[PDB]
Amino acid sequence: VINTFDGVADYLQTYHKLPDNYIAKSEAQALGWVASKGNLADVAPGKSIGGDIFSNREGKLPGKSGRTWREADINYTSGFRNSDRILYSSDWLIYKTTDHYQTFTKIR
Q1: Which of 36, 49, 64, 85 is the most buried (most CB within 10 A)?
Q2: Is 58 a catalytic residue?
Q3: Is there a catalytic annotation at residue 71?
């Protein structure tokens, strides 16, 4: 599994896609994932939540017409989700947050 800051970062730029271990929350839900039970590991072993759109409501991330932001969980293994995420734009700007999108710093 590729689920580290650098790992995923390096992967996105090579391939322009998330590593195989990611799945969207909708897909996770479809598999029986219940956020309140922190059972993700049970229904989809080896997977992490990744690839949903980040609406960037607070305009914290650099904007642009035609720029879409997506997010992915980092350092997840089991149980409840943590606070680490990578933010990637369609033009491949890579940002990180370790505090639940309060703050962001560029990593690529």
Answers
A1: 85
A2: no
A3: yes
Number of domains in the chain: 1
Method of determination is: X-ray
Domain that holds residue 1: 1-108
Which position among 16, 27, 58, 100 bears the catalytic label?
A: 100
Q: What is the CATH number of the domain that holds 10?
A: 3.10.450.30
Closest CA to 85 of 30, 22, 31: 22
Residue with tokens 């391939």: 15
Q: How far is residue 52 CA from its own chain's centroid?
A: 7
Enter the resolution in angstroms: 2.0
